[PDB]
Write a structure and sequence with these properties.
This is part of a larger assembly, with 1 copy of chain A and 3 copies of chain B.
Chain A (H helix, E strand, L loop, with lengths): L12 H6 L19 H5 L60 H4 L35 H4 L31 H4 L24 H6 L126 H4 L62 H4 L4 H7 L42
Chain B lengths: L3 E4 L1 H19 L8 E4 L7 E3 L2 H6 L6 H20 L4 H19 L5 H22 L6 H11 L4 H14 L5 E4 L7 E6 L1 E3 L17 E4 L17 H10 L3 E4 L5 H12 L5 E4 L5 H14 L26 E4 L4 E3 L6 H15 L8 H12 L1 E6 L5 H24 L1 E3 L3 H9 L8 H13 L2 H9 L4 H8 L6 E4 L4 E4 H4 L2 E3 H18 L4 E4 L3
Parallel strand pairs in B: 4-12, 8-9
Antiparallel strand pairs in B: 1-17, 2-3, 5-12, 6-11, 7-10, 10-11, 13-16, 14-15
Helix pairs in contact in B: 1-3, 1-4, 3-19, 4-15, 4-19, 5-14, 5-15, 5-19, 6-7, 6-13, 11-12, 16-17
The chains are: A little secondary structure, B alpha+beta.
Chain lengths: 459, 524, 524, 524
């Protein structure tokens, strides 16, 4: 019985790297100062995991790891490294797959309710390069789908677009096509995401799919359809008959033709038919963030970034991680340690670096303000994620101007093939400091960009 | 929950009805004549049981005030489980009685805090009175009797528990295992047994199950991770000179090492024992040291300066005997000085006081016993898993109660000691009328657990409580016979610690909860 | 998550109605008059079936208490299926008797603890009684009889099972895979059989219809990649001296090496064929160890003390006859001595049961089927999915019943053993009046299954029960023919194992559920 | 949601009940006859407490206007948390007084400008009179008295705190600790204590358990880290001839450094210990500079022209004794000259006079106390977590009272000195009739707290008011004894400046609330 005495891992991540077949899935048991001991384990896995009519077992039988087999290392700061093992589960001759109820009981840690979300920033623990052994392995995005046409992997191009004024509405193709007829940055337009044939939808639900019948201007017109015309149907049982073998003229460009990724009803369900052929249905989410759960007034959401570690198949251009956590009350080892981790002058380390046996694009999102004039800022770790530098259009009120910069899905090509340090992320331009005239809600207390709005006669 | 203000009796009676439901949901489960309670969980299997802590964890009510009072009284049950784990129903009923009667008094408007102070004085007096009235429990037959009482007249389990405790000794560990069949089985493992196996079936000896039995071997200690390193051969050189069987304590044995070892064995060259690591770094830190001490050997490491290249065959210690099978390996004993053993006990005494307490001191004690005493494994004979739930609950309750009772002694069950001491402590007084009234109400209400026991028997509580007060000493009431007799000599003896903890926790929570004057509640 | 308490009669009637619905669904499935029920299928068509455990699996009621009681009886039903596998009608009717006597005990104000203990004593006595009444079954004719009884009076299944018993032994059996033909078929194969097919274009060997067959080629697998053993000249020259066809099954061989082997076949100097490795490295190597022992050779390993590229005719295992098709590989006759066979059986002995049971049992039994058992597969022609479902259920039940009869034996069918043991234990006495009353109530209730059996035939329940009670021995009433006489001469036999297991689990669950006094309810 | 406008009395009316509700929550709680209120948290357990500010922090109702009035009045409670921590009940009764006086003022209609002028003038005059009435406090018995009255006449714990204060001196700072036992215990920690223990079990010095205790140690400042060059031998070997203890200060310790330390500890070269990096740059710089100066050590940094190879034998630091355990390293005392120590304390006081005046200065106070005082620990003997919380609230209130009295001193508590100074401030005059009215209104506003104090015990309001206002000096009323007597005998002595701050916050909030003109809120 009990839970432990099965894994006595007593070494740091170095041992978790040497094994190679260690996959981590669990919740951090860091009891919040203020919340006392009993509730930390009461709401961990006792009532939020499975429901657990009596108890269940796998066909292999005698699995010792139903509970959290915690090898968590706790000597300095309670750095939590806990895994729900998957490699020790049922291993079969040809497929290696377990039964129906095996994964259903243990692997879906649910933080549905517990207060462990006030501030919890989780930086880097990732499945190493030894992942292709008995697993499929996703490492492809739109920067790697049409890669032969000019996109390399890491920050090397994309298909996600910036929109010139007007922001959205009065769809460009009839009259505002000149905004899209500028290959200089108008190249792939998307609309607001909370739309489609949802049960809670307005009268426009008919319009979305109707956008399919107006694809008549992609062949004889001289332009290729690159709008997110929201025609991805809900009911799939129609394509079955004809399109299978030859008539696949629509293409693999799930991020050129529209795709509905709202985060609740679609996910990555495409796994079934396309285990190996087309595992890349792009994470087609319109760029909306910092307005749903991050705000202390409106907190609607949850934390699942640890469990999203398998989701790299989508090619994420947006994930609702949260915020840096700036504001409220500071002091008592003030929360400005974001700067104090690297910007401190009298620090030193001679020996090791960031090498977790399988590095990939990993850089936190620029929130608030981070300009190239603050070159001693955010460019230390990697500086770029699977995104392209695109912020509010405060200084972007011109037709062509610096034509190179506005190339949202093209200047990344040059700015990563230029090969000039981590500055490539902000190699584009630096006048973004004026963009605060448009969007206030990113710099509110520390940066002096809000000083003009209010606060008595001072500048 | 939302914030809404309510005042005075509006919450008070709710509290009353709140506790009123919870207690009579629980109190009815006592006694063989009483039944179990069904705990509703569709996501699980609704459980019909007497487990007090399970019921308490299952408590949640629709009414807001009743629900908050219920989560309040759940805390004391949880703390009791943290302390004792049984007699919890008694703690709940006494807490209900004291809180309800204190609220009854406060309904007359006396000062609640002075009442609490008087009750606290009474509680301390009762604590020292329990010290006075405690009867040591030492003889193993009485230990078996009290364990059977915890097992509720399960004689075979009681005798098996007594056997296990006698075999493990004072500090020997006793462990419980999930029974399978209808037959109770007690097994004692002597020495150190871990779950590790050799991968090559060519290591199988003549006897079935792949058991290799080897006495007077060679204790080997390796601190560095060695898997198949060809630099071991110098150590093999000593073995090459020895030509003797031996056991290797290494991380793992990979291709080349297993190959040479297997060919040596099958060709008859040399037979060697080498197995995959039972535990990781933290466990081997203990295992190498303790094996060296138990075997009288000197620790052999590869780090710092000392390494494998410099070594002696006599640097390898010896054991008594080892047995190996498919995945389990046992070592019966080794020749090591008691002085080192108690030196390790002394150095681990400082480890006993640890910031984790639970979940790890248990492992410390298990290690100490397996180095020194023996390990007890019981599979209780029973038919189905749901009833084995109650079987193992009774087993663990009896075990922990014996842990308390062996050192702290026992007193008669049924709470009769509480009534007897209430008779003892009539003259104690407080500062003023309030403290005196608090003492009076505490002593009046502290008879309730016994009257509830009587009610569970379906008999007159007042008459029994009015007669027992007439009696004294070892005289009391037997529920199984449902008649008076010698309470103690019949053998209903319980550790005094459970009574102390119950009364202390109940008093601490009651004093703070009885003084409430305003309360908050969720929106309708 | 807020819960409320209900007291006694309410949820009592709730689970009463649940068991009532269960018994209503079950009565139509009684005896030769047993009929089928439609079980809803969400996507496809619902299934007409008699399987009680599947019906329990499909239980879906709106009432929470009815559903939880349904889960409670589903628990015992599933355990009975795990132990007995059938008698589901018996389980339901005994559950109805249990709840009725529990209601009577509630009406009596009876002691549940004494009730369960007396029931336990009576059940132990009944275990003795059933061990007394059981008769060993040896003749194939009685085996066919019991197979027909379990297969719902189908003589084809009984005779088929008897044939398999006679020719391929007791344990050696395989599951059923049936056809669309509308006819019946049994295939039995002895020796080595495992799914592997040939791939290269030449692998259509000299036998017609794409068949492959060879006399004494030597296969040996090196446990690693076979790349430079494309050379393998000692193997080629050894087989050429032996003058035998070339056939080796290897772990993995390059496609170009396979191509040059095909070239070797075309030139005719050596006609070489190979297939893919059996399975997962560990279980594959265990079964290949079995194969090598049967062939008398020693397996080549990547980490053994002999070279992958080096082999000798004596290093090769030996066999007589092999047949390989596009799908499955078969070894008819191998060169092996019986002492190796019994040594492999001895090393099997421990792995037979272990604790894991099924997971390692299956292949082990397959292994047993390869060694001493046999390959037996039933291919019944049936195009309709609806009929094949029921056919599969019936044949699986008949298989399990035949195995239970073989291992433990049978008693008389029709449940007469119930009244016989009741009569033999009518004067059973307990410790006190409570035990006596509980035993008497259990005895009175345990004939209710038989009253249900007789009434569901639309005939005099009391009259038939009393008349059968008045007679003894083989005097009993046939419901299929509806007439009194010698029950054994009528061939009314049911395995003792299923009755014993059902009775024991019934006793356990009844003793557990009779403790129902207070219940918990949730919001609608 | 949508905005709602209310004008004049419409808002005023609402405001009333808001604070009234707050008053109902808070006013009754003070005093021995005062009780505690329950504030429950949905996830956690309810907290029953008497601290008014604890009630205030989570105050929220359904009504928008009442909620906003509550959040204004909560500002004084939050500021009490920030500065004082007690007298929160006084702030609340001040709020009740000011709302009553504001409604009366609106009834008569004085100019709010003149009203706030009179309020602030009266407040400043009260400050002046209180400063006139200030009484120094130096003896320990008055310290115990104020600790007891802060802990509501808790003689035991109050005397414990007074004794701790005496033994650690004024510079000793006390911490909050978890409760394990049933009784409080007091611990004194001297010198620099930090979470630094031995990495390898071979580091055991004479006092077992890996503890290294060295008298007059010799401390090396090894800036940053040293692994590859690894040769601190120019000083290491020199002190090895000196036969003296060694201490190393390095941020990181590698396998080589551990190996050579093990060599020194085992082979017997010389006693050597090492210490890891402290932490953040600021903290490590501070606690290394101060130690080096106090111990007379040499500022060693490879950031500056210096090396472990380029070193001087005078670089050693000196202490009295150092004790290192498994996790903690402690410097009991350092060897340094008095003038240098006092100069460094003077420069750290120059650091004290910091514009930050925040938690940085508190971490500096850590260093200052280690310079002069020590760490004080009261490990509570709390049984349950909620009683622990109440105990710690009491002790923190006592700590606040003691620390405030350290700088200010104490004056008669319980409002007797307050009503005395208000009676003196009864001769105050204003510029116009509005100002005079505001002054006298403030006079009744300050009379209000004392009369609510009287009504909390339900005593004669008029009798107490008259007999106290006419009286003077130490003649006053005690709630603990509930009778008149000498103030010194009653011993309710309070550092008034906390009340001073509370009353000036009350003046400010009255001045803002007398601006009640119109309000706009959101829809519910």
């Amino acid at each position: 019985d009990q839970s432990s005495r099965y894994v006595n891992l007593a070494l740091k991540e170095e041992d978790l790297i040497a094994g190679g077949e260690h996959v981590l899935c669990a919740y951090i048991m860091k009891p919040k100062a203020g919340y006392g001991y009993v509730a930390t384990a009461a709401h961990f896995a006792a009532e939020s995991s499975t429901g657990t009519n009596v108890e269940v077992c796998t066909t292999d039988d005698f699995t010792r790891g139903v509970d959290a087999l915690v090898y968590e290392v706790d000597e300095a700061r309670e750095l939590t490294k806990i895994a729900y093992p998957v490699a020790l589960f049922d291993r079969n001759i040809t497929d290696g797959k377990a039964m129906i109820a095996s994964f259903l009981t243990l692997t879906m840690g649910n933080n549905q309710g517990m207060g462990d979300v006030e501030y919890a920033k989780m930086h880097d623990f990732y499945v190493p390069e030894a992942y292709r052994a008995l697993f499929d392995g996703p490492s492809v995005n739109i920067s790697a789908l049409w890669k032969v046409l000019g996109r390399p992997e890491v920050d090397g191009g994309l298909v996600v677009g910036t929109i010139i004024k007007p922001k959205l509405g009065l769809r460009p193709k009839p009259f505002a096509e000149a905004c899209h007829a500028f290959w200089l940055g108008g190249d792939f337009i998307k609309n607001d995401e909370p739309q489609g044939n949802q049960p809670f939808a307005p009268l426009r639900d008919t319009i979305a799919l109707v956008a399919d019948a107006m694809r008549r201007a992609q062949d004889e017109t001289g332009e290729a359809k690159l709008f997110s015309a929201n025609i991805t149907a809900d009911d799939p049982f129609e394509i079955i008959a004809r399109g299978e073998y030859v008539l696949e003229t629509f293409g693999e460009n799930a991020s050129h033709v529209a795709l509905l990724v709202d985060g609740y009803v679609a996910g990555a369900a495409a796994i079934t038919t396309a285990r190996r052929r087309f595992p890349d249905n792009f994470l087609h989410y319109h760029r909306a963030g910092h307005g749903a759960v991050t705000s202390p007034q409106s907190k609607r959401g949850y934390t699942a970034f640890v469990h999203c570690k398998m989701a790299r198949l989508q090619g994420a251009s947006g994930i609702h991680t949260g915020t840096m956590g700036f504001g409220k009350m500071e002091g008592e080892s003030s929360d400005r340690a974001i700067a104090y981790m690297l910007t401190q002058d009298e620090a030193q380390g001679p020996f090791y670096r960031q090498s977790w046996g399988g590095m990939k694009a990993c850089t936190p999102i620029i929130s608030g303000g981070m300009n190239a004039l603050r070159m001693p800022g955010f460019f230390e770790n990697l500086g770029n994620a699977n995104v392209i530098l695109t912020a509010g259009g405060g200084a972007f009120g011109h037709i062509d101007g610096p034509v190179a910069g506005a190339r949202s899905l093209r200047q990344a090509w040059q700015a990563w093939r230029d090969g000039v340090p981590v500055l490539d992320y902000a190699r584009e331009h630096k006048e973004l400091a004026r963009a605060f005239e448009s969007f206030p809600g990113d710099a509110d207390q520390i940066y002096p960009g809000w000083r003009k709005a209010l606060g008595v006669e001072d500048t | 929950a939302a914030k809404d203000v309510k005042f005075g009796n509006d919450a008070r009676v709710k509290m009353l009805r709140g506790v009123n439901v919870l207690a009579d949901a629980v109190k009815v489960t006592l006694g063989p004549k009483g039944r179990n309670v069904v705990l509703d969980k569709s996501f699980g299997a609704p459980t019909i049981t007497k487990d007090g802590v399970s019921v308490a964890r299952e408590i949640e009510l629709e009414d807001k005030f009743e629900n908050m009072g219920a989560q309040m009284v759940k805390e004391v049950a949880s703390k009791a489980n943290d302390a004792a784990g049984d007699g919890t129903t008694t703690a709940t009923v006494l807490a209900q009685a004291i809180i309800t009667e204190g609220l009854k008094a406060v309904a007359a408007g006396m000062n609640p805090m002075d009442l609490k102070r008087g009750i606290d004085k009474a509680v301390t007096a009762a604590v020292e009175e329990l010290k006075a009235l405690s009867v040591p429990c030492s003889d193993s037959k009485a230990i078996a009797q009290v364990g059977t009482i915890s097992a509720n007249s399960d004689e075979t389990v009681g005798k098996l528990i007594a056997e296990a405790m006698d075999k493990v000794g004072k500090e020997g560990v006793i462990t419980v295992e999930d029974g399978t069949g209808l037959q109770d089985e007690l097994d004692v493992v002597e020495g150190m047994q871990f779950d590790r196996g050799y991968l090559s079936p060519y290591f199988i000896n003549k006897p079935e199950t792949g058991a290799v039995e080897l006495e007077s071997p060679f204790i080997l200690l390796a601190d560095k991770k060695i898997s198949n390193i060809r630099e071991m051969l110098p150590v093999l050189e000593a073995v090459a000179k020895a030509g003797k069987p031996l056991l290797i304590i290494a991380e793992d044995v990979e291709g080349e090492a297993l190959a040479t070892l297997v060919v040596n064995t099958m060709r008859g060259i040399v037979k060697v024992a080498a197995v995959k690591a039972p535990g990781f770094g933290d466990r081997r830190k203990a295992m190498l040291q303790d094996i060296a001490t138990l075997t009288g050997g000197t620790v052999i490491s590869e780090e710092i300066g000392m390494e494998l290249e410099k070594a002696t065959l006599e640097d390898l210690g010896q054991a008594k005997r080892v047995v190996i099978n498919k995945d389990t390996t046992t070592i019966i004993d080794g020749v090591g000085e008691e002085a080192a053993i108690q030196g390790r006990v002394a150095q681990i005494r400082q480890q006993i006081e640890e910031a984790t307490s639970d979940y790890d001191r248990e492992k410390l004690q298990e290690r100490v016993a397996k180095l020194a005493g023996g390990v007890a494994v019981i599979k209780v004979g029973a038919a189905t898993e749901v009833e084995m739930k109650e079987k193992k609950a009774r087993v663990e309750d009896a075990l922990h109660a014996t842990r308390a009772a062996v050192e702290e002694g026992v007193v008669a069950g049924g709470g009769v000691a509480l009534i007897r001491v209430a008779s003892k402590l009539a003259d104690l007084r407080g500062q003023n009328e309030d403290q005196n009234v608090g003492i009076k109400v505490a002593l009046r209400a502290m008879e309730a657990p016994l009257r509830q026991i009587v009610l569970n028997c379906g008999e007159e509580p007042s008459v029994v409580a009015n007669t027992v007060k007439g009696g004294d000493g070892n005289y009391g009431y037997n529920a199984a016979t449902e008649e008076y007799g010698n309470m103690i000599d019949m053998g209903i003896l319980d550790p005094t610690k459970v009574t102390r903890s119950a009364l202390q926790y109940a008093a601490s929570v009651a004093g703070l909860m009885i003084t409430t004057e305003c309360m908050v509640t969720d929106l309708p």
